[PDB]
Design a protein around this ligand. Structure first.
Ligand code: A79
Lengths: 99, 99
């Protein structure tokens, strides 16, 4: 698909059989998801952004599906206001910017 | 061009006669640049993201050029970690996400 940017590029993801929505975000190096309790081992981590840093839990090797496309990678889980799909998973689905 | 996302989608912009690099950012509603003097009057504004809120100055109707394509629109200046080009100007230059 081609997604225009008139509105926020929110799409449906599947994670663990749940559907959710998430923002496709080319300016994020990492993927950050709203608080949830996945199984698995985590590491603590701090990620930063516009106003500062928050604390998150890092899970590795998580499979997410983005508009029917699979990707497998690290996900950070924390008190984010929005689910963010970053470049580590966008590359896997062949996603480009074009103009 | 077509930009892949294996690395950060930094490009060169020209603004107020300077060259800067900025991040092409589909997850941002707005464009935020590092502190600089632009000509023009401005309004104080607040914007947020991960981490919280920062206070910026809003300049309207600013000409900026992004990889040789012109855009005229609102630019916020303030203590951002990185120069961000958001969706208000990506749409002007015809930017889409594709996969
Ligand atoms: C999620 C983090 C892990 C991420 N950080 C990150 O990737 N790094 C710190 C590494 C790095 C360093 C240098 C260059 C690139 N990357 C981040 O916040 N990235 C930003 C851009 C940025 C990078 C580095 C420093 C500072 C900023 C995202 O790409 C950017 O799109 C965010 C995404 C976002 C949206 C909502 C809430 C939290 C985060 N938007 C923003 O921060 C903008 N805000 C908004 O657009 N809104 C709040 C509106 C909104 C509301 C709801 C939904 C979407 N958007 C700012 C720039 C105005």
């Amino acid at each position: 698909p081609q997604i225009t940017l008139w509105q926020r590029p929110l799409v449906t993801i599947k994670i663990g059989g749940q559907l959710k929505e998430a923002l496709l975000d080319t300016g994020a190096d990492d993927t950050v998801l709203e608080e949830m309790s996945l199984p698995g081992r985590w590491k603590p981590k701090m990620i930063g952004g516009i106003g500062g840093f928050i604390k998150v839990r890092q899970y590795d090797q998580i499979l997410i599906e983005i508009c029917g496309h699979k990707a497998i990678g690290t996900v950070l889980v924390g008190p984010t206001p929005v689910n963010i799909i970053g470049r580590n998973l966008l590359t896997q689905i062949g996603c480009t910017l074009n103009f």
